[PDB]
């Protein structure tokens, strides 16, 4: 029965492919070379390479959030790998699976001391499962459970495969391995969440990240509708439920956001935290702005309220659970007013403040076009998209690192299918890694890119004014895009962003560069209320 | 707790980075790091440069420590900041070169966000990458822990990393006192050094190779005079290149590996007593390897210890051992210098063909040889440090151990930040160009003017050497001189060796912007070290 | 201020002596010489060594149980450490500390891939914290992390010290690092678990492995006193409670126990297991048996009940918010009648039985003799040694692996300070380790050992009848015993067993073997009622 | 010894290679000139062939060299120790190996020894027999 085999790399690229991986984004390396040879020679999946590590890592997460499936980065052993560690940290820090694919030295050829291994024990801090694959007999094996891991948590995954290893013959890769539940632990967590839920005076429904990651919108839909209470979603949950018979009364960003929906969040006796990533951080829940002993928490297949918590309790066995013991409805919300973007941009010879970028994206929604999911960096530039009319809003929202904005709308345009994709970056990010739109003819990809230059670390500035390291230099950026094969143009009033914006989306083929110049000092409106929330 | 100093922790620690010879303070600020920085630009204790991206933070201060033999400073933001300079930490920490990570952090009183899961993720990962770490969390007992730290530093010449949460940057606390003292073991240093002699009087081809340490330690001046006593071959690694040029016993040239002269790599290699004095071992690019040489007759010094005839003697620094050595040796005018060692190639053809490695070597050699002193030279990891290999310098600066890419341009910014107006030639390739040579954009801000040389062969060759059949290896055309003005300097493509002449000439009669000379090479066109490194691997 | 350093090796010694250590056992080699030369010479904890690995361990592991302290069991590199490691997974078994140092290469001599370490990964699957001193700067808090982990789970630790190490100079060891605990969920917890005991029908307290191995016997008394309900006690709970104003109603041990303690416990819709091992094993308490809607696990430093847990409560945490909320009572039962124990041993002609040995010890006792502690080896000794009187009883009643009892004895007599050790073993057990008694001279120890010679591995006789393979040879026990500086006598009538063991307590100096003839197919009535239960 | 460490062309046939009591040590040997044929693997000139049998390596080997009638057989390498002074001194190790030498020398066919870890095995080192089976390199008592 059976008895085929194939070459390890090639079982690799294929199981990922079982598991809905588009691409494989990645920069090889001596080590890394005859996996690449695999990649490129069988063409399982189609490979993306990038100029710098942090965006093959970058790319990938955004593809993997762009399909909600496994995303994939190649990389070779040493610098190549230690190069994409914030990358493979931030797709950590914000549930996306990215599975990171390190070539390292053959199993015969010793070791190399150089940081006496490091590389591996460094990305055991940044995943949640990991193997090096050395051994032919168990590989199959080891790729199932590895890969099952990140499709189980939602989180990175390390795969190490010395070079000698790459055409070892192995067995095909089978299913995931079951991470099976217990019937009455489940039943018993329902029970009580149910319970919680109706003896609440102020029950909140959050539905947030993991919701999207593990596909489960249509089912929250339904237990949306049956559970009868508001539904609010998280930054990284925006969007979900929005063709629900019950969409979200809005989102909760934290003191920038509206203050009712603030409110409601923070003083629900009934909490239901629907797949939600809590933190400190700036857009996202924060355990010290809640109630604790009313809050439940479903997130990590855990489920926590009164301080206890219900294990291996996978996000859609929970769901699926309540849905059971809810009866049907026909209730809506559908006959509200939809949300007000900022609209009507003054095309006229005044200089651009952020609103007014927001103004111009919107209005061209207004007049018709369909909108395009957005990729933004971390600045000024994602508290000004987040007044934008999108088809999906991918950002660092809670991780804040830097750099992800321009990579990520090229990792998603990779995995678009022909679907254009707007990025919005701020002149310190673009200086990171901007440059990676030398790519996009290779790619055969064209997005639009509209590039904040106040030539500053403007959110560093308003933080604290006083200093003088947040003046940066005037870098001209639309005048460098040719030099990597794009359109740029440098706009510094209203009517030359109108015109500019018209003719990026009229014109195909390259990518398009709009460089708004922005005065400093000058901010979108959710990042002054932020900074106000904060004196 | 504290109080009355009159000095805020921020600042002890700038004095005690300067009072070890730190020279600048690189970094790129964030919410966590703004008191920290403010501190620094305020009190200008070291001189505040920032960069574009982290990876260039860290390059920068490994140049500079490279640069001086001192201390290098790298600052950070917690999180992204922070993970984003790893991999120039570790590059650093491969090639023994003592940078001083200083990150920002959460307040002691405000938690964190703990989106990964001191036993924060953060620092687990530098505890990886450096030789000792302290979350200065308690003013009281910062001053002994930075002295701890930083005296690690300088022990073992490797990156070492600070946390400062926010509000402990402005506390007051005492002054930062002298690095603790390390253990010597005075009875294994004395048999250590007798049986060190014993072993190399005995070998019948003994060597002495001059490395890393050596130059990491100030130590050119005592292994000259060793070199000159103990009476044998001298030779350099590649980290040790440079080293006991002008002394009566020069090395006879630098061992690298297969890519090399094959007398010196037949003369180490063959060695049964080869005395690595202060050596990287490694299977790895230019540095000696475990698998190439007999250890058995090796005598290994490295680490603050020696490892000869099977055993090792702990505690010994190398400074110690070449005392003990010099006093157990009698002077001697033994002299070995002759007519140049390695023959630099020269004679450039400025006519119509195009342009390989080896006519950029030349075309930087003839001008030195007509007359202009060297500039010291930082390369990238490629062709382009096989290239320098053959070009006339006043010192190389490369990852040639660890051979990651993007160290080129940001460690020529960096060494020329302390360089004291001396210009420095950075050679880079187009795949590492693509990384992070946009750093030139700091070049006008920070008022240096580096003369760059970009191998543009629209391909990752050194790649295509190792699997030619890939497609993957091939690059797109990147216009990079079009680009140079967008970042305030003076870009120019070349074609023809003629071409590359001229601009050579232009670049350096014009300093006061950064000179971009993108030297397009065809693909399959390598420099002659490259090609011996290729047809070595066969 | 300070500035001392000590040598590693005895930095180590040290901590465990300030952390109740009493004696280090041990077996030396190569690469754990340095090590041993620092514990002989700096005297810090008396050093004893044994025969066999395997005595090594178990005499850690009693030693820890006989004073709730930590064990130390020193072994060399490679087969020492090897060798011990059934001990070690007893001791995890039944949460002993046993702290396992072994020696090790020093850093610089490379490796020796004999096995390719094995060794500290094969350690890592049988203790709660590891640790590999190589770097003299991070030792003192790696000393400290892990043997505060075992005390804080009351299991194995594995502390591996390169050879070149043991003199390096280092800080002294501080304090245990703190697992501090969340107020909040504390009070939760003793909350929801005390709302729990009193809406059961039948609530019962069952007091267990951790109470006493955390030394909370008082705490604990006062605990039963205030919640008012029935107390019983796990097979290693034993004794516990027996001077407390409501002591134990009696021990639960499964089948073969009291009908009436067994259905007390698993009928009972409150049942709060204060600090059990649960496990389908002979004598514990088992999952299958007990209603999981209603029990409440307070265990590994987590309480779980209703499905659900609360972690990082600390057992004596959990006590003393308990009784913070409890009145204080008057309450006592001591006013019942004592247990029935086996007497009247007929000093007659007629062979011996496993009871007629319970009933010539129990009728010392009666006549005036205080208890002795008994050690008991896996096998019907130890289903015999049920109906003694004791002053404690140590036997692997969980894990069931044979070769406990001796070394366990000596490990016991060895810390005793004076008091005399009885040890029970059967014949197949005293063949693998009851030779260990050659070192009590060395040892300076007398135990008393009562070894039940059937000539047959009778437990399996009784389970499968059938074979021929459980018919053991006679091997002349009580003959060897002079070799290996004891007194040995055969004893084949009840006359001569009641004359054997007044002869034993009479004769101190060497220790003292019993050995018991007794027929194959008879049993100690425990193990007959297990047996019928099986059925 | 000196034959073997000083081998610019050590055919190690079948090796385990470790750094332990009697095995073949990586650290003695000069592993740049030294032909590792183990674990269906070949290692040398600094590379390694993987999915080598010895059996195979073996008959490839033969396949490759003529036959030969050279021999190097002569008189036994390393003398037993024979004649035990069986007299009133105490005893010593070498003498157990001459009491079980002597008796094969008067014409006792050789028994195969079993030794455990110690100077038993040093001493067994020795001892004319008819196989040697012990913990060589492991070293477990
Ligand atoms: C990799 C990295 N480095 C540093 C930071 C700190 C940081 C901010 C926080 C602390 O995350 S905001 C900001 C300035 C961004 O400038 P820009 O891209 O031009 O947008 P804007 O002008 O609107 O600020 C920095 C440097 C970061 N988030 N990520
Ligand atoms: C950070 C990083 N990523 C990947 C590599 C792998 C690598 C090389 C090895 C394995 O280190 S050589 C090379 C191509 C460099 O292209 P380029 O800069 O244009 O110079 P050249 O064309 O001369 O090769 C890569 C990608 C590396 N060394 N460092
Ligand atoms: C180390 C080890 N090996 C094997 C067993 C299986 C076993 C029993 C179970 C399965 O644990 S009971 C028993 C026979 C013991 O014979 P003995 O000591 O003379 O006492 P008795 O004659 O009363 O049986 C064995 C071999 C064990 N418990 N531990
Ligand atoms: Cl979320
Ligand atoms: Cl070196
Ligand atoms: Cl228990
Ligand atoms: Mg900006
Ligand atoms: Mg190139
Ligand atoms: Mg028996």
Same sequence: chains 1, 3.
Avoid at 329 to 339: L, N, V, W
């Amino acid at each position: 029965p059976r008895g085929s085999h194939m070459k390890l790399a090639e079982a690799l690229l294929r199981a990922l492919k079982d598991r809905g991986a588009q691409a494989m984004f990645g920069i090889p390396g001596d080590f890394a070379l005859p996996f690449f040879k695999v990649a490129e020679e069988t063409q399982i999946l189609p490979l993306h390479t990038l100029s710098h590590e942090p965006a093959v890592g970058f790319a990938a997460d955004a593809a993997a959030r762009y399909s909600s499936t496994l995303g994939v980065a190649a990389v070779t052993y040493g610098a190549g790998a230690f190069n994409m560690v914030n990358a493979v940290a931030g797709a950590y820090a914000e549930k996306s699976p990215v599975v990171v694919i390190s070539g390292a030295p053959g199993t015969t050829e010793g070791n190399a001391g150089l940081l006496l291994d490091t590389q591996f024990q460094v990305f055991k801090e940044i995943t949640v499962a990991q193997a090096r694959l050395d051994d032919p007999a168990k590989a199959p094996a080891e790729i199932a459970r590895v890969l099952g891991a990140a499709r189980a948590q939602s989180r990175p995954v390390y795969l190490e495969i010395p070079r000698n290893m790459v055409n070892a013959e192995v067995e095909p890769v089978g299913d995931d391995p079951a991470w099976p539940v217990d019937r009455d632990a489940l039943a018993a967590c329902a029970d009580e969440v149910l319970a919680a839920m109706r003896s609440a005076t102020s029950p909140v429904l959050m539905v947030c990240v993991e919701v999207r990651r593990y596909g489960l919108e249509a089912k929250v839909a339904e237990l949306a509708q049956r559970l009868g209470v508001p539904v609010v979603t998280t930054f990284m949950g925006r969007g979900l439920l929005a063709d629900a018979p019950t969409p979200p009364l809005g989102t909760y960003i934290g003191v920038a956001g509206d203050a009712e929906i603030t409110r409601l969040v923070e003083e629900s006796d009934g909490l239901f935290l629907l797949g939600a990533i809590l933190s400190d951080t700036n857009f996202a829940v924060s355990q010290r702005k809640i109630d604790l002993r009313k809050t439940i928490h479903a997130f990590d297949r855990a489920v926590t309220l009164g301080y206890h918590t219900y294990a291996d309790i996978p996000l859609a066995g929970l769901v699926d659970a309540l849905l059971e013991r809810l009866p049907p409805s026909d209730r809506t919300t559908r006959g509200k007013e939809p949300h007000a973007y900022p609209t009507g941009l003054q095309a006229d010879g005044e200089p651009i403040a952020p609103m007014d970028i927001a103004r111009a994206v919107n209005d061209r929604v207004r007049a018709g076009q369909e909108p395009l999911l957005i990729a933004a960096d971390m600045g000024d530039c994602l508290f000004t998209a987040m007044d934008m009319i999108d088809a999906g809003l991918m950002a660092p929202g809670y991780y804040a690192g830097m750099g992800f904005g321009v990579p990520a709308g090229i990792g998603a345009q990779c995995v678009s299918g022909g679907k254009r994709i707007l990025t919005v970056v701020g002149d310190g990010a673009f200086q990171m890694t901007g440059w990676e739109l030398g790519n996009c003819r290779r790619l055969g990809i064209d997005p639009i890119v509209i590039l904040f230059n106040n030539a500053s670390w403007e959110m560093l500035r308003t933080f604290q004014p006083e200093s003088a390291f947040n003046d940066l230099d005037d870098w001209r950026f639309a005048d460098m895009a040719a030099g990597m094969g794009g359109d740029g143009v440098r706009v510094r009033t209203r009517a030359e962003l109108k015109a500019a914006l018209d003719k990026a989306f009229a014109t195909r083929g390259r990518f398009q560069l709009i460089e708004a110049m922005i005065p400093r000092g000058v901010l979108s409106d959710t990042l002054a209320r932020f900074v106000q929330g904060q004196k």
